[PDB]
Each structure stands twice: as structure tokens, then as C-alpha cells.
Symmetry: D2
Subunit: 456 residues, 4 copies
């Protein structure tokens, strides 16, 4: 739309698009921070709306906000949460370091929309006011960190942890299914003593179980909310019950165990909870990288690699590219880079406020999307369909030199070592070398060399 | 649109939206890699279209593609470059690690659209074919690295370097404007011997000049193109002149000095040129971080910080938050994290192909957008308006202890040191301490203690 | 001056006055890379692992009492600092740590032979592989030593120093609980808080970090020993893995347990990737605290200057009062180091293949360095800086009261509009808030002193 | 056994048998952090900087000939390895490097005094600040020593080793130019190329890296010396900065120049952030090359096994043919280290304030470590692995010809459809391409041998 509406703040008037619900401060941010393409993610917009909805409820409870205004603000916020206003949040990640401008974006959109819901209009004649009403009892300095932790905790609980559990269950099923398939071990990339395919997969399972525990340990700190610390952490200009009440209300409307931060100075001056929680996520990325690499190397072929397993072929001779493994290894690199950006932002607070916050939460929520969706994708498009190539597994095992120790108790170490050395030097199987030396019969070799007895 | 069109590839048929121009392989990628929200950036889509346009021209020159088809493909590509088809490229960064699926996305969209341009239709009855026509003489393995370098070199030449030069010029103007304003030095954050504000700013200028040179040194390697190496670098199934011809044609239509890579194995197996070029970008990020921090610390106040300079106040007592500095310091952290992701991807090639490519170019082009747009924003909304607070600069200088050495040649080191120690112990100015001891008159102090003689 | 030792590749000359053997000597000619060697903590953890393995092997009837006792005595000599020069190998060796495993096997075998009345060298009475390495692989020994060194370093160095620094800052927070100062957000003047409140943020950060570090300890306490080459424990007694974890727990007094999944224990460094995540969290917190301290102490005249710190280095007599915050500089530098170390660790931890992660010397080099840096850095910062933090009460009050931030105390007395008018005239004309108020006749001097109370503005 | 030395804080006991003074002794009690000290390269660069400053100060008539000569002689003793134990200070010190600057001033002053027939200690004839530090600040000395050490290490260690490894791999590429092998993309069988072509990719990578490293050298050659405390050169001779850069260029034979902007030179570590960017590029290239080598050598029976590498470590007689790629492991580990070091450097380089970057000991510790790792790692990988790479010609040909990838050679002879039909039956039934072709009667044995030529499929 070309037509404009004049919106005002303490700096003066500025034109906004007539068909939009934001106000003067959103427009100034939009115009002054035309930096790349990264915007607040929907999860964070929703967390800001939840924060305003909770603040409106508590302000009404405390007699600070009229029922009529509080109810209209909560209705406007519910419209945002229902996906009706995604285009009303146009601001960049690369804005003021406190997130003030996105706080004001929510204040302006909710105020203009709440005014409409009370039979009023958007703009200067509005019935509901962004600062006096929607931002009542609040500062950008405690709202934006609150929205960061609300978005982060809900994403971990509702997306990442469920997908981690699902992938773990699938691989546990595979470990059980393949518990009796003996295969060659590999250490240093070299043929090594055998283990079962189920044992190898049980390592992946145990990795994902350990990662879940580490991620769970990080959740209580992310559950601490800054809301109520206002500008510098003292809670100046708040009711003494407000901080506990608004954390309780957020816990009610999200069904997550939010609590008010016991030290609001730590809560405002740092992103420490997110630095620590992302430490657990980069641990998961290192684990998933290893699992994804094992899968694609074991599936490599079809004839000039390892080829011990097959994976589902999802996108169009015999060349099956392990594309889910590639997407997953790529996003694991991304999580490692994101951790460095977060660490720099988290290390860079000054005095009463950390002002690297849009960048920190942009990276953090991206890592959660990547790991959650990446595990979901890898599970349904790869892991559920992993199958052994039993003939190839057996070919590699039986043509290796690593079953030779099964001969020791029968013919002695010295003759067994002689057989292995002859096989290696002359390019023979262990059986052919042993027969050539006359040290055993073929029936004895087949009776004695039992891989299923060599895996514990 | 709910209605579908059936599109086919070697795997079978799949439904695509009837109002879209992509084909079966795009649809499979869209459905199989629902991972987060990051998609190919427009710069990369354009670079893929340029690559197809150049290949079509050369294939026609070599008698391998009919004029009618080549002209229609180039027309379709020009529509993409003109911004008419942005919604036809729906694929995620987190796809196959070669970028095959986005290569096929361009092949399918250009083929379906070129078919329409020849009076045909989109879909299975098309007159122009994604693989046989649009991908003629090509592999995903040399197309996607080519598009990576085309996008990267053009972004560096057309966005980043011009904005770097502009910011450098502004700060050079400020350095000249403030060449005679003496201010207190600060080392270790402690008061130190003086320098002029122009000298201090000249350090920022020299930093940006050095960064431009480092960035320029990285451009020749990015200008090397993989196109013509086909699947593994040998150029099997290409005309012997094709690699040089298509690099020449890309140089023509982009006005940039693209050349064919002298070693196609290095070009396919690595992202080394981008690892190195991003090394120069993280150098620029470290420089810009320092410059941005100097600006916001020198502007800090209005009464309880340093306050030696003022900056433009762009968004609404006396509290001017340095929001451009905050956006810039945040994106500098992002570039550092992006470098780690790129380094991991670049270190992780195997044999004939590096398959971490969508992630590498996603990070690289993001860093270029952030640095280019961040410098553009910081320049126009902050740097052009930096002004000294001359009274505050002089207050700090004259009330410091650091002008005392101007007394040495007049009264001797021992008396000058005595004056400084008395001033420090008793909370006096140097002048008040010197007068209290009777070692000089006020006229002598004012005549002898000349900061403009202490800066070289 | 040299003796001839042998391994399966043949004979090689070894310095007669050293206790290592042929394989260690070979490693010295093949891995001459930079200057970083195994740290003493890791050497000690390797000796503890061999000491425990010998005890359990003796318990199970696999190793004779005289050999097991001599191996334990030689290991105790290593732990007692008698053999630091017997471990010359680079970090940059075989990625499983085989060479350092064999270094310990050879030193302990040659020394145990002497303790039994024998000699070092090929006539030795105790044998590096058959005796000192019995029931073991390099594959499960080296990750065991990694976790023993890591857990003990966290328990015995880092966590005590973290608690000590926290207690110091908690005392400072209480001592300065009533000192009102100007807040700063975005580096700009902001509403007040007490110096004690500000320091209480630092304290809460260190308390949270301690919890995060504690959460990482159970996984590090899981030991690979008993998984042998690929995790199956082939050729080992079924009780060996539990017994050797129990023995390590006894002799170290730390809660070591056998890893419930030996394949995860051999194929990854996941416990250390996770534990180092908590350490880089502590580095980001310490960076912030150290930066607050040095910015608050900046000056003495052209910075903030709200606190003083101890002056530990000599200055020039003509520059009295220049106090560089050198403890803050050492601490912020090592915090950068921990962030870089984390990336190296993450790359190594992401890079296991199949049954074994072979990035292990590098991973543990970084991890133990970060622990030394953080533990020693916290000790140094505490002793030489934090214990001596003092307020500059006159400067704090000058900044607070000459600022514009106390104007909101006038709201409920003369309304928002009059108070704003006071702040703008003070700013515009360079006046104090009281001056711009008296000049506009909006209150008397006594009303200002009564209404504008910073001690009533900190919650 | 001790002597009493003094600085402006008073007297302190110093070991009588050491050459440092009061300030170095104080640093030893205040910076007891971890184990990392200044590396020898940096100590030598500091001694060279003092040697050059003394020469120029003598030229300008500021320092007596006998003192300047004695200082230069003492510096030459440091360069000759006679005083390594006189530099005990941690990396984790004052962020300007003041303490190590004073360490060199005190050692050279005390030793120069002895060379003049005097003694060490407070009766010395040569004075650490007035003589050895004349015309200098820690602020411009330490960045000068950083760049001297960095440039010389790149010129004298890293670049020679890079060239040596490149030449070895170039010889291997030519030697194996006619050996056709199976390509691999996405880890999957792909169309053929020669082993020489594959190795030529490694060579081209190392050649490109050399160019990138060379591009970083001019900025590192810019020296801060002459900027003194804040960059203005206050209290220095107008020719001093050029003269001392010229003198360093003479005595090192390297193209040092005075930094054209001393404020950039003092306030940043930008040259080293940029130069380390090229080193992490080399680390990513070396990681890839090392991984190709160890994957291509994997086996001996259940991996790829296309090449053999030297076996440098002993194995077990019952496991012949297990050759761990231990040089590849050391090299990939140190490449991870370089990536982490880059992050530490970037954080330090981003963190200057106003006139001085005070993250410098940490920055140069990382930078010089990366140079040692890459130079020594390339030397080790070359000598103990790359020079011995050989093809397993039978295995290469087995993989190539038992694969499905040569089927496209049949296209122009029997059409696309028949060739595809051959590949699918071979895959479906586990046949060779020739077997599935003869079985379907689409060609004779002689037509297959004539048509399917891998040596005609590599461009």
C-alpha cells in the first residue's frame, strides 16, 4: 500500500504504511537498520506476545490496568499467537542490542490492535497505548530477556527434546534388531577386532541418551525469568508481588516451569543461561556429526566403499547419495559456529545490561530449529530404514585378518601369527593360508573361527 | 493453490503446486528437508541463473544447443535475474551437501518457463528439458561451486568494497576535521599521554584501509570457477574449449574478472578460496568491533561516562543509546561464528567433492551482507555525524595528571613529580598543586603546559 | 651412555640414564611437533590408571604379587614427582594416545624391574606390554586417564578456586550493600542501584556456573577401562571393568564408575565436550566480571573511577595514580583462550569414526589447559585484585548526584511534566537537577533534599 | 643465595644466580597462571628489538658506545641460547606485555653490566629503563617483537616446510599420472580420475595456500616501534622509528618497515588476525589432504586400501598389516588446534580499546603456536608419510573394474538404454558390467575390452 498513516513518538511524527498495525518506533527501526535479511523468528515474536499477555493479566490483577484494556490486549496477543499478524513484525536481528525496538514493535501492534478491538482506531487517536498500557510495569531491559528465555525453553521442551527422544528410540530398535550381526571393528580407520552391528549402534544410542541428560540439566537456568527487574534489576516502579505473579502467569499459559530469576542483576547483565544451554547443544552437534558420519561411511558404495549397511534412497545406477547425513553434518557445523557467536555476545555484557541480545537469541533459536528438525528429518528419512547388507558384512569379516586369534587356543599363538603373516604377505584369506601350511583342515577352521564368540 | 500438477523424474511421479514452475526434484527436496527456515539467498539464486545463462550461450556457440532453446533459456534466466520468480526457489540450505537440489531447482524452473516462452507448457509435455537442455555440459558438482564463487565475488565487489570505501572516506574527513583537537590518551583504560582526536580517528581509517587491501588480495582465488570440471574434475563429456568459454561468458555478463580454475580438482574438492576470503572478513569484523566500541565508549554519558564525542540520536532526558554501534558489534560476533562454521565445512571435503557447500555459502554470503549493510548503516546513521564535545574533552585533559611532563624542562623532573604526587594524593589539579607548593605562577603554568605541543 | 632396546621393528638406542624404552624412543623421532607435551595432571592420571590395573590384575590372579607391587611402587614414584623427565612425548602424536600409553608402560616396567633387584632394558624383570599393559588397550587406557585427570582437576583445582572467589565477592557485596551508585545500560547513565547489588550479580553468576560445572561431573566420572580395543572387552575378566573403576575410586577418593556403554566411551569425547561447555560458560561470566572491575576502576581522572583496585606493579614517579588493571588483563586473555580451546575440542569431539575417537591428545591438552587457566586465573584474580576492591565513595556520589537520572523522584511531588522540564533545562544549560529546579522556582532547596532520595530508588 | 633488587615499590629478593630484576620477580608472584611462557621465538624477537634500539640510540648520540655494545652483546647471548632460563614469566600477564618487556630490560642490563666489568643487581653499570628501554615503551616494544617473531617464523619455518611438502606431492602426482582409479563424490562410487590428478588437487591447494600466506606478510612487516606510549612518538627523535625498522631489517635480513600509522599499530593486532586467517585456511586444506591419505590407506582389507603409507610404529605379530595412519592423526589434531587458536586470536584482536590493544601475550602465544604446529606438522607429515605414499595397483584396478561406473563407455556403441540395462542387471544380480553384458548378449568379450577404456575416461 502506498497510502500512509502518521504515527508519533517523543521524537516526532513518521509515516507508516496505512495497512500496518505498528507505530513510530517500529518504523524508525525498520528504516534505520536495513542490515541483511535476518528478522526475529516467529518463536521469539510469540514469546514476546506471551510476555505481554502475562503482564496484562497481572497488571489487571494488581488493579493497575483496567479490565477492558487488559482483556483487549490479551485478545490482540492471542491473535499474534494464532498466526494472524506475522507481517506486523518487520524488524531486523541487527537492531539495538537490548531488543528495545522489537519490544516497542509488540507494544505498538498490540496497542493499535487492542484499540480496534475496543471499537477504536489505529494511530494517534488509539484507545490503548503502547507505553502506558501495553508496556505497563515493564522495561525493554527485562521484557526482551524474558522473551528470549520463554522462546528458548519452549523450543527445547516442545521441539528438540521430543525429536531427540524419537531418534533415540529408533536407533535403540535398530540396535536390538541387529544385536546378533557380527561385523569388523574399525579403529584409526583400520580393520580391528569384531563387534556386533547392534553394539555399534548402541554407542549411538548411549550418546543420544547422555545428550538428553545434559540438555535437561540446562533447563532450570533458562526457566529463570528477568521480568520484574525493570531497567537495572532493582524492580523500581513495580509492585512487590509483580515479578512472582508474572512468572506464575507465564507458567500457567505455557505449561512450562518458569520462575522469577532469584538475582535480577545476573538476569539482566548476562546471557549466561543461554551460553550454558548452548554448550549442551554443541555437544549434541558433535555427537550427531559422528553418528551421521558413521551412517554415511558404513553405507558408502555401492562397490568401492564399505557398504555394510543400506539407507533409504529418497531422491534420484547404484549411486545413493546420503543426503540426510549431509544436511545433518552441515547443520552440526552451523551449531558450532553459532556457539562462538553466542559466547562472544555472552562474554560482552557491561554493567547493568547485556546488549548483544538479538544476536544471541537469533543464534540460539536457530540451533534449536536445526537440531530439532534435523533429528526429525534424519529419523524419518534415514534412521528408520537402516538395514544391514549381511552378505557384504560377512565378506569383509571373513576376508579380514582379524579373526585369527580364534586359532590361538587350538594351534598356539606362534602358528596363528605365522598364518596371519602369510595371509597378509601373499594376499590370502586366513583359511587359505592355514590350509596351505597344513596346520588345520577346513572343517577345523570353520568349527574354531566363530565370530559370534568374539564379541563378549 | 490446492490443485496439483504431476511432475516426473527417474524415481517416479510427484505432485507439485499447479501455479509453480519447479519440477519433481525440487518437490522431493522441499518435502524431504523441512529443516529450519534458512533458504538459498537471492544472490545465490541469481548466481545460479547467471551460470545457466552462460552455459546456454556457450552450448549454443559450440553447436550443442539449438538457438531456439538457448535463447528461451536465457530469457527465462533473465526473468529470474529481474526478480520475477523469487517464489519459485523454495529449497532449504540444509539439503544435499553438493547443492544438487538447488541446481535441479534452477534447471526445472528454467526448463518449464522456457517451454512456455516457446509456446509450450510447463510439466511433462514441456518443450525444454531440465537435464538434457538446461543442464547440458554440466554437473551439480561444478555448477554449485561456480554459483558460490559468482555470488561471492559479485557481493564483495558490488556491496562490501564500496561500503568499506565510503565509511573509510567519512572517517578520513573526520580525522582531518578534528586534527587539532587534543584529548587524553587511554591505555589499559587508564589516562595516558595525549593525542589528537584526529590522530585517534586516523587509526580507524588506517585499519579500514588495511582491511580493504586484505579483502582485495582474496579476490583472485574466488574468481576461479569450477565450471567445466563436471563430475570429478576431469571434464569428461565437455568440449575442450567449454571451460574457458563459459568463464569468459560469465566475465562478460557480470563485468567481473572470472577465470576458469587452473586445477578443477582443488575447485571441486574444497571451498578453500572462500575459507581464505572469509579470513579477511573476520579480520574486518575484529577491526569494526574495535571502531564501534571506541565510538560508543567515547560517546558514553551524558554525565557518568567519557562523553568526549556526540553521535546522532536516531530513536527516542539525555540518554542516547548508541544503537548503530550495538547492531555493528552484534554482527561482528556473527561473522566470527560464521567463520568457524565455514572452517569446519572447508576442512571436511572427501576425495573428489566437498559436500558442505550450502552451509559454507549460506554463512559466507550472510557475512558479506552483514558487513556491507552494517558499514552502510553505521556510516549514514552514525559516522557522518560524529562531533567532538570540546568543553568536555578539555575538562578531562586539564583535570588529568598527564600533562605534568610539560613542566620538566621548566622546573625539573623532581619538582614536576612532586606536583603530580601531591595532586593525586590530595585530589587537586596539577595547577592547584603547583601553586600550593609555590613552584610557579598561574601565568607560567598556562604558558608552559601546552597540550598542542605534546602530540608530535 | 646409551642402551639398546627392542620392539617388534627391531633395536634402537635409548639414553642409558632414561627409563623409557624402544617405542617411546621411536615416538621421539616421529612426532617432533612444536613444544606441547602431556601435562603433569595427565601423566599422573596415567600412572594412577596403571596402578589400579595392576592391583586388579593381582586380585584376579593374572599378575604376580611381586610384579603388581613393584608396578604400583613405580607408579607412586611418578605421582611423587620423581620421574617428570621420563615423559618427553608431544601432544601431537598418535590420536589414540598409544605413544604416551607405551611411554608409561616402558617407564613403569623398567623402574619396577629395578625395584625387584633387576635392571632397566631388555633384561628387565617386568615387561611393558605383558605386565604393565595386562588386560588393557591404549584404546581404553588413554580415555580413562583423560577422565581421571579431568575429574580430579575440576574437583581439586577449579571448583575450590571458584568457591573461594565467590566467597570474596559475596563479602564485598554485603560490605557495599548501602552504597548507591549510578546504573549503566548501553554504557549510558541509568537509574541507580547499590554497588552491593551490582556485585551480587557477579556472585550469582559464579554460583550458577558452579552448578553447571557440577552437572557435568557424573559423565566425566564414567571410565572406558575394560572396553579394551573396540568396546566388547574381549579377552578380559568379566569383573575387571567394575573392579578397576572401584579401585580408581578408592585411590583417588573420587566417584569413578565404569562407563555403562563402552562403545560411547571409546568412540567419543562427549563427556569432555559437554564439560568444556560449562567451562566456556564460566569464561564468558569471568570476562564480564573482569571487564566490570577494570572499567569501574578506570581513571584515575578520565574514566569511571568508582572503585579502586590493588596496585601490584611499579609505576613511574611522574605518573602517580596510573594503576593498570593487570589481573583483569590476564583474566580476560585466558577467557579468550578458553573460547578457542572449546572450538578445538568441539572439532575433535565431532570427528570420531566407528569404534574409536582418535583426536584425544589434542582434546585433553585443551581441556586440562582450560582448567589450569580458569583455576589459576580465579586464584590470581581473587588474591591480587578481588580481595582488595574498595569503593571511591566521593566519586560514586559525585557521579550519582551530578547525573540527570534522579529526576523521576520528583514525579509524584510536582508531576511528570515539571520534572521533565527540570531535567531538560539541566541538560540544556549544564546544570545540576537541583540547580535547574531552583532556577525554575519549582521547589525549594529543602524540598529537593527531602524528595530526591537515591537510597529510596534501589528497590 | 639471594640478592636484593629495587623498583619504585621497594626492595625484593631475587635469586642470586638469575639475571632478572625486581619487576620480573614481582611478576612471578602475581601471574602464577598455568604453565605457558613466552616461546623462544618471541624471546629472541624481544632481544633483537632491544639490540636494534641500542644501535639506533647509539647512532643518535643518546646512548654511550660502551653501553650500546654491551647491550648488543648480551642480546646476542640470548639469541645464542645462553639465557633461556632467565625468562620465567607466564603468557598470562599484563596485556601489553610490559612484564616480558621488563624481563628483557633487566636481564640485558644486569648481563651488560657484567660485560662492562660490573656486577648484576643494584650496583649495575647498565640500567634496565634508562639504558635498555631508552626511547621505548612496553606499548610499542611488545607489538614490534610480536611482528618480528611472526614474520621470521613464517619466512624461516612455515613457508620452507610448505614448499617442501608441495614438492613431494608434486613428484607423487607426476609419478602416478597414469594410474586410473575410481572417483568418489558424497563418499559414493563416481566416474574415474587418475591418482596423479587427485594428488594434483592437493598440490594446487598447497600452492594456493602459499600465495595467501605470502599476501599476509607485508602487513606483519609493519612495526610499531617509535609510536611509544600512544602512537605520537612523544619524546623520541624524528628519525628513530625509520632507523630502528631499518636496523631490524638489516640484522634479520627481512623486509621490516615502520608502520605508516602507529595508532593502528598500537591499538590493534589486525595484521596477525589477518595472517592467522591464512593459517586457518592452510589448516583446513591440510585436514582434507590428511583425511584423503588415511582414508585411501584404510584397511588392509575392510576399507579402501588404494594406497600404502610407511609403517613407523611397531605392531603385534598376530596383527600384521594393521598400519595406523599416525602422521595423519597428529596432523588432523593440530589442524583442529589452529582453528581454535584462530577464535582466541579473533576475540583478542576484536578487543582493543582506544590507544592500545592489551590482549597481546595471548594473541602471540596462539599465533606462534599455530606456526610451530603447521611448520613442524608439515615437516613430520612429509618426512614420515608423504614421501612414502605408494599405490596399491592391484587393489586400485580391482575397485575400478568391479565397479559400475565405467558403463557410460558403452553409450556411443550400444546406446544409452542398453548400457543402463547392463548396469542395472549387474547391480541387481551382483555381476560385473562385463558379465551382465555378456549374459544379455549385448556385446562380445572383445567388444567390451575394446569399448570400455578407463584411460580414455579421465579427460
Amino acid at each position: 500500500m502506498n497510502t500512509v498513516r502518521s504515527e508519533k513518538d517523543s521524537m516526532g511524527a513518521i509515516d507508516v504504511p496505512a495497512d500496518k498495525l505498528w507505530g513510530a518506533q517500529t518504523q524508525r527501526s525498520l528504516e534505520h537498520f536495513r542490515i541483511s535479511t535476518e528478522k526475529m523468528p516467529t518463536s521469539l515474536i510469540h514469546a514476546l506476545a506471551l510476555t505481554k499477555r502475562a503482564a496484562a493479566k497481572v497488571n489487571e490483577d494488581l488493579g493497575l490496568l483496567s479490565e477492558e484494556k487488559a482483556s483487549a490486549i490479551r485478545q490482540a496477543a492471542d491473535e499474534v499467537l494464532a498466526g494472524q499478524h506475522d507481517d506486523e513484525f518487520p524488524l531486523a536481528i541487527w537492531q539495538t542490542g537490548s531488543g528495545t525496538q522489537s519490544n516497542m514493535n509488540m507494544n505498538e501492534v498490540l496497542a493499535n490492535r487492542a484499540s480496534e478491538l475496543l471499537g477504536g482506531v489505529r494511530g494517534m487517536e488509539r484507545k490503548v497505548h503502547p507505553n502506558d498500557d501495553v508496556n505497563k510495569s515493564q522495561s525493554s531491559n527485562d521484557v526482551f530477556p524474558t522473551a528470549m528465555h520463554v522462546a528458548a525453553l519452549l523450543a527445547l521442551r516442545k521441539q528438540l527434546i521430543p525429536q531427540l527422544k524419537t531418534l533415540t528410540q529408533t536407533l535403540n530398535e535398530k540396535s536390538r534388531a541387529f544385536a546378533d550381526i557380527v561385523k569388523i571393528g574399525r579403529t584409526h580407520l583400520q580393520d580391528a577386532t569384531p563387534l556386533t552391528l547392534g553394539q555399534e549402534i548402541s554407542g549411538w544410542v548411549a550418546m543420544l541418551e547422555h545428550n538428553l541428560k545434559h540438555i535437561e540439566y540446562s533447563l532450570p537456568h533458562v526457566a529463570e525469568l528477568a521480568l520484574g527487574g525493570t531497567a537495572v534489576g532493582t524492580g523500581l516502579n513495580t509492585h512487590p508481588e509483580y515479578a512472582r505473579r508474572v512468572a506464575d502467569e507465564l507458567a500457567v499459559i505455557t505449561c512450562a516451569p518458569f520462575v522469577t530469576a532469584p538475582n535480577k542483576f545476573e538476569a539482566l547483565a548476562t546471557c549466561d543461561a543461554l551460553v550454558q544451554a548452548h554448550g549442551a547443544l554443541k555437544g549434541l552437534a558433535a555427537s550427531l556429526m559422528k553418528i551421521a558420519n558413521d551412517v554415511r561411511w558404513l553405507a558408502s558404495g555401492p562397490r568401492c566403499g564399505i557398504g555394510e549397511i543400506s539407507i533409504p534412497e529418497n531422491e534420484p545406477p547404484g549411486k545413493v547419495n546420503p543426503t540426510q547425513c549431509e544436511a545433518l553434518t552441515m547443520l552440526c557445523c552451523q551449531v558450532m559456529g553459532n556457539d562462538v557467536a553466542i559466547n562472544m555476545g555472552g562474554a560482552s555484557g557491561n554493567f547493568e545490561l547485556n546488549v548483544f541480545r538479538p544476536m544471541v537469541i537469533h543464534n540460539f533459536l536457530q540451533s534449536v530449529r536445526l537440531l530439532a528438525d534435523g533429528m526429525e528429518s534424519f529419523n524419518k528419512h534415514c534412521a528408520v530404514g537402516i538395514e544391514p547388507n549381511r552378505e557384504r558384512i560377512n565378506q569383509l569379516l571373513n576376508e579380514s585378518l582379524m579373526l585369527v586369534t580364534a586359532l590361538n587356543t587350538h594351534i598356539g599363538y606362534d602358528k596363528a601369527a605365522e598364518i596371519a603373516k602369510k595371509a597378509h604377505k601373499e594376499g590370502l584369506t586366513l583359511k587359505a593360508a592355514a590350509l596351505a601350511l597344513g596346520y588345520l583342515s577346513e572343517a577345523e577352521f570353520d568349527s574354531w573361527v566363530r565370530p559370534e564368540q568374539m564379541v563378549g
